[PDB]
Amino acid sequence: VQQIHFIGIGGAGMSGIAEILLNEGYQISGSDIADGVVTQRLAQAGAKIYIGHAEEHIEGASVVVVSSAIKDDNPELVTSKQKRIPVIQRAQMLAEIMRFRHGIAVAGTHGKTTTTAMISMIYTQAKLDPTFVSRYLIAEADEFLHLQPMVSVVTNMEFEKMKATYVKFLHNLPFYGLAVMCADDPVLMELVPKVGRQVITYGFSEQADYRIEDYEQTGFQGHYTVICPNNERINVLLNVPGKHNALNATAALAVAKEEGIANEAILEALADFQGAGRRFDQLGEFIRPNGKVRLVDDYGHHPTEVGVTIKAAREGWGDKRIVMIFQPHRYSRTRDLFDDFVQVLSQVDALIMLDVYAAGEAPIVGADSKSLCRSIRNLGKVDPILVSDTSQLGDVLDQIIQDGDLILAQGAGSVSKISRGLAESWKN
Amino acid sequence: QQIHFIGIGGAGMSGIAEILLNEGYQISGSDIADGVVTQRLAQAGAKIYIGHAEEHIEGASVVVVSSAIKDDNPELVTSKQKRIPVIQRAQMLAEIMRFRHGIAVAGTHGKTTTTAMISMIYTQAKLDPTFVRYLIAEADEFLHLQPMVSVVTNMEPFEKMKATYVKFLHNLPFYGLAVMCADDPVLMELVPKVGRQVITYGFSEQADYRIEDYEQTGFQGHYTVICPNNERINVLLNVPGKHNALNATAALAVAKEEGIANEAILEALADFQGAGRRFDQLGEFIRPNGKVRLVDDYGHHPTEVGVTIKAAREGWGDKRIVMIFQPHRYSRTRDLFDDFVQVLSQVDALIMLDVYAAGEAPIVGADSKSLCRSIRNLGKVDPILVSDTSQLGDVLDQIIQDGDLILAQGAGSVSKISRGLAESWKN
């Protein structure tokens, strides 16, 4: 079979598999209602894509792949059945693509994305040129039973039907396959006996095949040792915070060694593994007249993320004073999550509030920075300072600084444009 | 890298072991008994521990177990205790099919024979395929199976089942092949839900591979097969019945669709020797009152016995059909009682054996003394019930006539009886 037809090829989920099949050598065709980044891309790679579903669009295809985004009624779908042509779903196709390939499947409730990245970062440095979503295929497995990987990670499980679902999911490993599981999860460990494949554990746990000890988090970096199964030590430097990432890079490390990669690569990848965006970006330490301070840039603009960042920093040092500069993004948001903002932002030591970055929005009474500030002042955990003319920031700051202050420039508006200008000044 | 088999001696377990070994892995396994197998295996480089002892688990990675291993086993308890995975038989088998070009044959009736036919075909094509890079295998209702081709010969005693075949059909790759009998409506009715190319076969006008001009002469079948390019092939089949024709064809279609040469297929089917216990000719014997023929059949359901019957008639001119029939299971007898009466009433002489329990308790009204009666009341043939196996030879000799065809029919110990009987009659 030589021509494959995708109905609605620009939907995510499809382009990807389509591109894979395309590089494999198949002929590819499909259709969609909109011509955009995706279709133009596949298109220049050699696909034939129509715009609009039309019954003549099937000619030549041997199989036709469709999404659940496509509906019972589609002329292409409909016509295909009539013409015999095997119609298969995105899922089955993805499974197929795995069958003759060496795929690693990252599953669990938490950590899937980061682990997946951590593994790819690793295989890449290893010069393995893996494919991610050569012959290696790194993929995120989200709660699926179709995937036919050769390695499968389950980071954690946090009902009996769910339990059964995972068991079904691991069962798809080959007899010689590997399951890498978190030793620190009882649910998991309770499932081991039922697995029926080789099992590698990683964790802080007493009994971990790959054990983590003396982990310590310095600033937004993590420091720790891992004990491979033969009792050989590896001192890890992880460029992101929290034990939880230690856990995910250890699923990664675990998966990596056991396919034979040099510790050098493993370590290099992680050393240089960012959170995929603007998180904990340290702009520099600066000696000001009132002290030496670290100035860090963070994109968190929703009470939750804002929370993680503060907790991270707290654990980061342990005595440092956190002085944060926050710029609420959008009036809508501040209105909707006001009380939540008051709470989180009262978790720091000194707070300077910038005016809301409107992003397009017209101001909303009582959802602005004076409004937050007052509400915060009423809580009495922290007495905020409001700075509407950013031109003044550096000066207000220099007056409240204290030796060894961490300064978080927090938000997503022009806040990072502002903090950078603040470094430039200070640099001068 | 090490595969250990608990009770490797079993056939079904040896096959996989052997295959696993030529692949290049490293096998060990245990059995209470030494024997042909084990030495055969041991001799290829298998470490066969005669007898179960938790120490035979040395350097293994996974343990393959049959369905005959039970709760008390020593290698079992430590295995589990040592964190070594325990795999059953098929999954372990399905694994093997994965990276292979499996052709799996499935269905109600004809699996056994179809797989056979198919193997001899590829054998003849000099493909040297493995049977139980090619892998031809029989699949009995099988969802672990990852085949590149799957045949489905038929499906007859439900919706629940139907759904199962469908899913089975699915395990095929997107680019795979389903070969299904075109003359069967249920089958022909699931077609759409396949989601894969389907080729069909049979006598019916719409057959991709269609049968025409079928005539059984001697106990051989002659007929012509219309391949998809209206290209014509005349087939000589060394086995009787339209049923077998059907089987041979699905075998031909797989071969054809794989590009094999007509000459190799035609040779294959013309050279067919028959699957054991399937209209199996055990030979001619001269008894005091006739020279008779003795044939061993498996058919236990009533339709299968029917074809068997029609089959023999089609090749025994004017002569008589005598059957020794052994119902299998008390439950089945009751379910299809009437039909059993109907089909068993179509032979010239009938000897009935007692039901072969297969485990069941007797059900009142469903044994053989009850069939006999019903059958008698029908009045087409007067059955004789033979409860004391030892008396069979004698009762047989009393009713035989020169030229009889005698059918030892059934799934239970009837075959073993018949062979003993033959043995006895040879000497």
Q: Label each residue of chain B as H, E or C.
A: CEEEEECCCCCCCHHHHHHHHHHCCEEEEEECCCCHHHHHHHCCCCEEEECCCCCCCCCCCEEEECCCCCCCCHHHHHHHHCCCCEECCHHHHHHHHHCCEEEEEECCCCHHHHHHHHHHHHHHCCCCCEECCEEEEEECCCCCCCCCEEEECCCCCCHHHHHHHHHHHHCCCCCCEEEEECCCHHHHHHHHHHCCCEEEEECCCCCCEEEEEEEEECCEEEEEEECCCCCEEEEEECCCCHHHHHHHHHHHHHHHCCCCCHHHHHHHHHCCCCCCCCCEEEEEEEECCEEEEEEEECCCCHHHHHHHHHHHHCCCCCCCEEEEECCECHHHHHHCHHHHHHHHCCCCEEEECCCECCCCCCCCCCCHHHHHHHHHHHCCCCCEECCCHHHHHHHHHHHCCCCCEEEEECCCCHHHHHHHHHHHHHC
- Give the separation between CA A265 and CA A348, rounded to whole angstroms: 38
Strand partners, B63: B4, B86
Look at B80 and A193 and tell me if their CB atoms are within 8 Å.
yes
A413 C-beta neighbours (distance < 10 Å), count: 18
Question: What is the nearest CA distance from B198 to chain A, expressed in angstroms?
Answer: 9
Superfamily for domain range B4-88: NAD(P)-binding Rossmann-like Domain (3.40.50.720)
The beta-carbon neighbor of B174 closest among A86, A195, A196 is A86
* CB of B97 closer than 8 Å to CB of B146: yes
Method: X-ray
Question: Which chain B residues have a beta carbon less than 8 Å from that of A96?
Answer: 173-174
CB-nearest to B62 from A86, A96, A175 is A175
C-beta separation of A114 from A140 below 8 A: no
Kindly identify which residue of chain B lies nearest to residue A173, measuring between CA atoms.
B95
Using the beta-carbon criterion (under 8 Å), do A88 and B175 form an inter-chain contact?
no
- C-alpha dihedral, B297 to B342 to B338 to B240, nearest 10°: 30
Please report residues of B whose CB lies closer than 8 A to that of A176.
Answer: 61-62
Flag if A62 and B194 touch (Cβ within 8 Å): no
For A86, the closest of B87, B95, B196 (CB atoms) is B196
Among B138, B153, B256, B308, the active-site one is B138
* Apex B395 CA angle, B389 and B397, nearest 5: 125
The span from the CA of B335 to the CA of B133, in Å, is 44
Q: Which residues contact B327 (CB under 8 A, 6 or more apart)?
A: B300, B333, B340, B353, B355, B356, B367, B368, B371, B410
Q: Which residues of A touch B91 (CB under 8 A)?
A: 175
How many cross-chain Cβ pairs, A to B, lie less than 8 Å apart?
Answer: 46
Residue B62: list chain A partners with CB under 8 A: 175-176, 197-198
Name every chain B residue with its beta carbon within 8 A of the beta carbon of A100.
99
Dig out the tokens for A323 from the structure: 């002085």
Beta-carbon separation of B85 and A176 below 8 A: no
Q: Minimal Cα–Cα distance from B254 to chain A, Å?
A: 17
Cβ neighbours of residue B339 closer than 8 Å, sequence gap 6 or more: B302
Q: Which of A6, A83, A85, A175 to mutate to test the interface with B (most CBs of B within 10 A)?
A: A175
Token pair for B271: 């050279």
CB B403 within 8 A of CB B321: no
Residues 6+ apart with CB under 8 A from A230: none
- A92 and B175: CB-CB below 8 Å? no
| Minimum distance, in Å, between the CA of residue B119 and any CA atom of chain A | 26
Both tokens of A257, joined, read 């060694």
* Widest Cα–Cα separation across chain A: 80
> Which CATH number does B89-275 carry?
3.40.1190.10
In chain A, the residue whose alpha carbon lies closest to the alpha carbon of B146 is A99
Asked about B249 being catalytic, the answer comes back as: no
Distance between CA atoms of residues A358 and A368, nearest Å: 10
Residues in A whose CB is inside 8 Å of some CB of B read 1, 62-63, 81, 84, 86-88, 92-93, 96, 99-100, 174-176, 192-193, 195-199
SS (H, E, C) B6-45: ECCCCCCCHHHHHHHHHHCCEEEEEECCCCHHHHHHHCCC
d(CA B398, CA A91): 68
Q: What do you get for the CA distance between the two ends of chain B, in Å?
A: 53
Q: Which is the CATH superfamily of the domain at A277-428?
A: Mur ligase, C-terminal domain (3.90.190.20)
Check B62 against A193: CB less than 8 A apart: no
How distant is the Cα of B87 from the closest Cα of chain A, in angstroms? 6
Residues of A noted as catalytic: 112-113, 140
Q: Chain A: residue nearest B197 by CA?
A: A86
**Pair of tokens at residue A176:** 């010689």
Task: State the smallest CA–CA distance between residue A172 and chain B in angstroms.
Answer: 10
**The domain defined by A5-89 carries CATH number 3.40.50.720:** yes
Closest CA to B350 of B328, B371, B330: B371
User: What is the CATH architecture assignment of A90-276?
Assistant: 3-Layer(aba) Sandwich (3.40)
For this entry, resolution in Å reads 3.1
Longest CA span, chain B = 69
Residue whose tokens read 């239970």: B412
Gap from A49 CA to chain B (nearest CA, Å) = 21
Q: In the structure encoding, which two tokens stand for residue A321, read together?
A: 């004073």
How far apart are alpha carbons B141 and A79 in whole angstroms?
Answer: 33
Q: Measure the CA–CA gap between B90 and A424, rounded to whole angstroms.
A: 69
Cβ contacts of B19 on chain A, cutoff 8 Å: none
Q: Inter-chain contact A87–B194, Cβ cutoff 8 Å?
A: no
Q: Measured between beta carbons, which residues in chain B are less than 8 angstroms from residue A192?
A: 83
CA-to-CA separations, B347 to B42, B279, B319, B384, in angstroms, rounded: 50, 15, 11, 13
d(CA B297, CA B412): 10
B89, B174, B206: which to substitute to probe chain A, counting the most A Cβ within 10 Å?
Answer: B174
Look at the block and give the residue holding tokens 């603009």: A301
List, in order, residues 6 or more apart from A37 with CB less than 8 Å away: none
Q: Is B308 a catalytic residue?
A: no
Q: Whole-angstrom Cα distance, residue B401 to residue B278?
A: 24
Would you say B112 is a known binding-site residue? yes
B95 contacts A174? CB cut-off 8 A = yes
Q: Torsion angle, CA of A369/A373/A374/A379, rounded to 10 degrees? A: 140
Boundaries of every domain in chain B: 4-88, 89-275, 276-427
Task: Classify burial at A160, counting beta carbons within 10 Å of its beta carbon; exposed 0-12, middle 13-18, buried 19 or more.
Answer: exposed
For residue B167, give how far its alpha carbon lies from the nearest alpha carbon of chain A (Å).
13
Does the beta-carbon distance from A81 to B194 stay under 8 Å? no
Pairwise CA distance, residues A172 & A154, whole Å: 13
CATH of range B276-427; options 3.90.170.10, 3.90.190.20, 3.40.50.300, 3.20.20.70: 3.90.190.20
- Residues whose CB is less than 8 angstroms from the CB of residue A372 and which lie 6 or more positions away in sequence, other chains included: A328, A334, A338, A341, A342, A345, A353, A384
Separation of alpha carbons B28 and B6, rounded Å:
9
Cβ separation of B61 and A192 shorter than 8 Å?
Answer: no
Q: Is A71 left (phi over 0), alpha (psi -120 to 50) or beta?
A: beta
Query: How many angstroms from the chain centroid is the CA of residue A200?
Result: 24
Q: How far is CA B398 from CA B351, B371, B392, B416, in A?
A: 12, 22, 10, 21
- Given an 8 Å threshold on Cβ–Cβ distance, is A199 in contact with B83? yes
Compute how many other C-beta atoms are within 10 angstroms of the C-beta atom of residue B5: 31
